[PDB]
Amino acid sequence: TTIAGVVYKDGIVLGADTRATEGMVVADKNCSKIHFISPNIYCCGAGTAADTDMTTQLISSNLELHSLSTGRLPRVVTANRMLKQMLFRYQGYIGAALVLGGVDVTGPHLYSIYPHGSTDKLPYVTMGSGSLAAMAVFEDKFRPDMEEEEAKNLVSEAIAAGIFNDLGSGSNIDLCVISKNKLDFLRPYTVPNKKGTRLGRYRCEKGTTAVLTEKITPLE
Amino acid sequence: SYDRAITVFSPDGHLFQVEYAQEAVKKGSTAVGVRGRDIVVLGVEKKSVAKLQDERTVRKICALDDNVCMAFAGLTADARIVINRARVECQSHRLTVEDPVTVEYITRYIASLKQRYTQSNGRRPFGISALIVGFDFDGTPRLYQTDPSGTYHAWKANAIGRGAKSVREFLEKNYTDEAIETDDLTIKLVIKALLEVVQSGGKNIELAVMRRDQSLKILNPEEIEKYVAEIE
Amino acid sequence: GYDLSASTFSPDGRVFQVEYAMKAVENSSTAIGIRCKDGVVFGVEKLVLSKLYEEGSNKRLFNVDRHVGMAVAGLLADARSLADIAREEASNFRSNFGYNIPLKHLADRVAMYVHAYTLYSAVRPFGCSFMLGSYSVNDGAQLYMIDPSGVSYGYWGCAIGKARQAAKTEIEKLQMKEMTCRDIVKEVAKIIYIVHDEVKDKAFELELSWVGELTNGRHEIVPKDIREEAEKYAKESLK
Amino acid sequence: SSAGFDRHITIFSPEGRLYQVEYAFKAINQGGLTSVAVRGKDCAVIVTQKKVPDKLLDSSTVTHLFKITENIGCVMTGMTADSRSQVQRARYEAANWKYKYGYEIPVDMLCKRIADISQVYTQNAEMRPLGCCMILIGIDEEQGPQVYKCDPAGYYCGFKATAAGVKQTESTSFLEKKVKKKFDWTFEQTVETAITCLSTVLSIDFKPSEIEVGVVTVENPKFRILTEAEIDAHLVAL
Amino acid sequence: DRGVNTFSPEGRLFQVEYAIEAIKLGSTAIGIQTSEGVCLAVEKRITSPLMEPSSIEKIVEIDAHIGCAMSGLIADAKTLIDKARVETQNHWFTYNETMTVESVTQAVSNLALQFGEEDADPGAMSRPFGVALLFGGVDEKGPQLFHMDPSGTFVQCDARAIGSASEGAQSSLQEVYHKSMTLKEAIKSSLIILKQVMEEKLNATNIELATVQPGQNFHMFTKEELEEVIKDI
Amino acid sequence: SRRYDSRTTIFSPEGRLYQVEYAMEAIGHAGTCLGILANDGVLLAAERRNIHKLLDEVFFSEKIYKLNEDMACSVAGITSDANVLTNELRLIAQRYLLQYQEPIPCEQLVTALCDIKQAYTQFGGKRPFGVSLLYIGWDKHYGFQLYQSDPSGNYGGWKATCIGNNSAAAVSMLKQDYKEGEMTLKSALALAIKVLNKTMDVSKLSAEKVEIATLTRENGKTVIRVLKQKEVEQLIKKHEEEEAKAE
Amino acid sequence: GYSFSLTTFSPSGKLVQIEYALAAVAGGAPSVGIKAANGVVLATEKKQKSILYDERSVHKVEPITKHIGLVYSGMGPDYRVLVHRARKLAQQYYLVYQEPIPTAQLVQRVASVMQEYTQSGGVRPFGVSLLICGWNEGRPYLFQSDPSGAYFAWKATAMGKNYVNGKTFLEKRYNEDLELEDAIHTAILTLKESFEGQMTEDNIEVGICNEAGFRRLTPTEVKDYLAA
Amino acid sequence: NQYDNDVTVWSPQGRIHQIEYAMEAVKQGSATVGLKSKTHAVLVALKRAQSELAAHQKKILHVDNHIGISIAGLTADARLLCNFMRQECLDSRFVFDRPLPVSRLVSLIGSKTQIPTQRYGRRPYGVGLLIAGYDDMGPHIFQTCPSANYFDCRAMSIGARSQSARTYLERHMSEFMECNLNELVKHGLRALRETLPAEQDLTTKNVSIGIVGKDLEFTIYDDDDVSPFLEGL
């Protein structure tokens, strides 16, 4: 798992892999590591997927009461102090590693939320098993106040750098773009490699399988 | 939790909720039973049927366990809670003692429950009165009446519900040692006491006799009428 | 039946149980205090019911903390109730922040506890009224009152007892803010003796205490040497 | 009419008027005071009467203007016992916002949680509705000046020119007359407008000692009380 | 109309004033304290002949050397007798000695007047005990006899008459009682007073006797030995 | 505070409960519902008290409130109190499925409820339930069953009975027209309207004011299907033809 | 807290307390919804006795969820209790099933909360009659929840003052073939019956629920509908 | 009408009617008295005679070695409040691990009596108490009102006809400073004789006298041990 994000001029960018592996064997190539918090703010995830999943919806419904009662847009730092407050209660049992980003009335903000509750504020952060190789790319070509297309080229270069290196990431690249007004989310942004075409034919003819009993129940 | 004073003392020392609880069971059905020799006979009166009712759910006579079988009169609701509780305690003595309950040990628990709800806060007293029959390890017949005040007494014969004092007058006169010796006369004594209150004729009662061997089996209405033509 | 409840407000929007409890002070003996430059002087006129009482009994002067004393009026039953309650926030505030509690702070804590009992009908509202005072470098002389409803006001002077509006008449003209602690003692007892009732009431005991620079901010009872100067001055002014 | 326990506790009247809520409306009249506030464009002002009947009173410790948060003050009219109760509460409500939710609470969300506590009184006979009315002012990053009021009935409905106390009825006639001129006298001099209200209906013209004024501005977002000398600066203008 | 705790202008506690009035409607019981032992005789007041008298015992065994006697409402009595049986064993729980009769009634009287309708206990008495109790036993200090007040007042009584016949019987006990009376002399003298106040005919059926001696534990007299005293009267 | 307590759990000087007495007056003014026990199955009926046209029905039924796969109910009384009773039965009937994994017998389900219905008539100082309802269902042993639960918690088996308004005269007319053992699924449907015509003020029913649900077993499984308005209207016309021939 | 019920049965046996609860809704702000083919239109009367009041804060029509919103007739603070409850009962659905909640489901949960305060003591019933609307399964939903907690499915109903006379005009002119645009017109005409004054863009708050979800109309957009 | 039946209702005069009804129960009952001298403090308790056969009463309980108490009015809350002091004095040897000063004991009892007065459904303790104790400051005599108010007296009498007993205390009070062991009880006996009816007399049977002092621990004296102390009559 490799997740990363940067802060450009008019907004931020989030990115994640699609690869979810159980142990040493790949499980889901369609998995979405990027989740929806609020219309203006989304969040990434790594570590334990199920822990990040439920934790995402626990804080998401809390911001639903916020945005509906306040009638205004939620803030990045708002949800940031909820995560470290809930993770501090569990003293590190939850292995959820989250990356929160969005654009509020203040501006673009990007945070890095550790399982123990440690939160930092950075223009760019990398989490997951490939956070190392992904950080090396941001330590190089990162420039302050870049453009929109310049960020999508830098991020996707960092995720693919980890995909080609880390074993726990790949099969597709997912990105998200959040500006002050427009919003762009492309699940299938870039596919680094595709499955090869099968040469032979493994299809078996009908009747080659021995069937003992058979039952058919009609329905409406 | 609801905490209030329900049953409180009054002038002369009377308890209203305890006295008013008796007014409910005195207006119910008439239940009569007699302690015999080798057999105990107990029966209750049914208000009406009119062919539209299931005779199984209207049964007042129930079975707490194999040996002990209890019936009730008056308000039916409260009795449902006691029967559900007592049947659990029938196993509790069988649990520890590894012997079946007596008529007294099941009555003390039922008497202890009625005591607690005539005293403790927030609970209304039971408006029910029951007649408990059963045999001991030696097969000795025993009858212990339960009172809504929480006490209990023993009786050879007695009645509860409407006309409980009128039936008791009929039981004191006709009770003899020859009636408890003959199973027929023992059954016939209870039927004659129940027919005194009923002026409508026919069979309004559900009669069940509980012996030793092959314990209790509720008598069919044809078997009940079999003894009606003899006493008629 | 508006009176019976704690809860109710009468068609005029008035809480009777607090007003019925407020009359507990008007039926109680006079206890007054004066706020001077270097501190605040406390005093109590203690009604003597019988001579069999040991000298110093039914003490109406409570010591809340090193810098804070207490002079209680009304029913002594509820007075001792808030006594130990005042010792709670006293031991609390210092267990957390580590300071001698400022009188403004403590005046807020005990005001909420008194008002907490006026909201509910399940408890009787406190009708007693007690006086608190403190002297410190930053705050200086501080004298506050706790009403039976939980209202806290700042006061340069205090008139409490069977005679309240009549006791402040002589308190109206003082100019004690030009005077220091040890000179207030003569003014305190002078007001206490003139407001005493010689018809219904018979004998009383004078108990005085103050906090100042001579005491280094400590609450202690006035010694008998200065105490006897009262009768040597105020009693002579009675003629 | 009153049938049974209608008048004694909180239950539906035959007209469903909730008599206990109506009895709380007259609880503010026990103080016999009046409080008015009017919000401007870049500023907000609160002008209310501070009555000192006894010369032994300490004018610094007796006030209706308390500091709630950095950007929000308050003024309350009613029983002082009921007044001081909301003080710690509104502080508990605002500090829970700054810790859990993690930033400065608006006047809208600060006055909305107060009505959530006050509505508990109307539905419970164990606890009485408080007869205090809160009036808060604050500067918002978007809506600017925010003036919201919480009554005993539990209405958080926001106002523009605010009135409270015994004169809350007749004092609106002075404020409702302002619907002609722009934005109900919205200036930097709005401090003078609220002072005219109290002096108009009561026909007093308080001295500098009898007036207490909290002010929040865009230049000074913090709640601040003006000294009696600074009050005379506006009083000499008239 | 009133709470569980209310004092009148006397400040009795109403509920107890009404609880004592319930004892005056109960059966008559008279104990006697002599140098040899303590005898207890209680009238069963059998209503109808079909009732089995052997099932009703108002004199029950508490400890080996300590018995019990009850009067008035039996419903509340069946509790304390189960409580006192624990308290006697609670003394065996620590001191490994026969519990003194003084501490028995002393400990049982503690539960008296424990009640309330507000936040007192998820369950507990809504009314005080309307039962009068006479406890007796032989300890190292000799035989003793105690009485319990619904208000919790315990007092040592040489001869005490309780029940519906309590009025006028206490005056008769002062004349017949002496300090030289033996156990058998107190027995016969007790039934004579009981025979007068009883509306029915006193016999070995409806009467219940029990004796406690320093050399003999708690024991009851069956219908045989009961008739022996009846024949002598 | 005892001053404001209405004392719902106190006994009357005659030994009754004032809240339970007035609970029967509630259902007395509510809608009329009846049921019939037959050999082929069991049915019900209901008189809808809402004749307004703009009223819709979202999820097939109104007062039916299907209890489980093996049975449903019919309620007459306050709809509110009737809503919680269905919420409680659906839990207990599924608590049967947990603890048992069989179809729940109708006798066991009504037990666990009427025992809970009695608690409010006993302790808690709360008003009792004002809903007297019915049950249609089927079990392994005694087969199809019909029960009537009073607000006090005293229930009993009924072959034919009625609840709600005009239940007195209803049940009196059911004694004459009922036959033991000869009741089928069809003939029992045609007899139900005869009582519904005399109870309701109007002469004929539009089949909108009434709803009839059938409960039977087919292919080793019980099937609960509410009769469609067309199936009801066609069955009402069959009763209309019998009224013309009888006169 | 008093455990005993503050509401008991009459000798008549109609509950008294909720019977007087209808007198509170009869004096509240009227709200008239209409169920159309493609959606639902909601318009209520927001009255302010003086210009001093601020109408940019209080909303009688507030969003419950994305696809569900609520309008009321009755007491203000009693309605505030339901808003926080109705939104939290939906989070019990959202945190679990991860889908939109049906209106038939959300109203039945509110129906249980209505009763808890009618029966249990120490708490009074609600004096608010809710009207909840949502869009699910491609079908419009319009419901009304009485203070007693009995949910009634309606198409076009009337609350507030003269709710009996409000059904008159609704029963007169009402078509199921109408669409979202046509239903907005008749929604204003019902409130236009007797306004006891002059309605403006600030005297009415309109909202709609359809495939696009639930939202409210700005006072400028309502002015276009106020031309008739 | 509706004032007297509730504990927390404030009278229109500003007092607690329930306290007024709580004190009347203490004012009506058995009479007790106590005194204090320089190095010693002695109390005398009268045991009211209900009948010649039964023992009169028990008016005195042993709290600790240096502290003892006499009770009045109801016995129930008497032993209740006694059980408090039983545990509190043991807590003094637990926490402080020294003799508990009597000045602190009156403060703990006052905190226990004020709780039921301020809450609904709780009656005030209707038991007046008289405490005798000794510490490094000398002996003390403390009176416990049924109200939460705490008293400190040189002498006092709680019971019927306490006015005549206090009148005797207004005379010899000055002489109570210097007394020996014989003169202590000498004033106490004749003080109790003022409360006795004109047709009765003070004997050894009806008197119970506790004595606590510097070198004398608190000990209860029965009819046998009071023989040398009554020779001065």
Author numbering:
A (entry chain B): 1 to 220
B (entry chain Y): 2 to 233
C (entry chain b): 6 to 244
D (entry chain V): 6 to 243
E (entry chain Z): 9 to 241
F (entry chain X): 2 to 248
G (entry chain W): 4 to 231
H (entry chain a): 4 to 236
What do the paper's sentences say?
The 26S proteasome holoenzyme consists of a 19S regulatory particle (RP; a.k.a. proteasome activator 700), which is responsible for recognizing the ubiquitin signal and unfolding the target protein, and a 20S core particle (CP), which hydrolyzes the unfolded polypeptide into short peptides of varying lengths. Three of the seven β subunits in each of the two β-rings that align this proteolytic chamber (β1, β2, and β5) are proteolytically active, and between them hydrolyze most substrate peptide bonds to generate a variety of short peptide products. We show that 20S proteasomes can degrade the ubiquitin tag along with the conjugated substrate.
In order to better understand how a ubiquitin conjugate enters the proteolytic chamber of the 20S complex, we performed cryo-EM single-particle analysis on purified human 20S proteasomes before and after incubation with MonoUb-Cyclin B1-NT. A similar analysis of substrate-incubated 20S complexes resulted in five classes, with one class (S1) comprising 29.1% of the particles in an asymmetric appearance. Incubating with a ubiquitinated substrate for a mere 5 min resulted in asymmetric structural alterations to the 20S barrel by destabilizing subunits in the cis α-ring of S1 relative to S2 and the proteolytic chamber. Discontinuous density in the cis α-ring was particularly notable at the N-termini of α2/α3/α4 subunits that define the gate at the center of the ring. Discontinuous density could reflect potential conformational dynamic variations in the gate region of the affected maps over an area of sufficient dimensions to enable entry of the branched polypeptide at the site of ubiquitin conjugation to Cyclin B1-NT. Careful observation of the models reveals variations in the gate region and in particular to the reverse turn of several α-subunits (located between the N-terminal tail and H0 helix). Indeed, we observed binding of a ubiquitinated substrate induced discontinuous density and conformational dynamics in the center of the 20S α-ring of sufficient dimensions to potentially enable simultaneous entry of a few polypeptides.
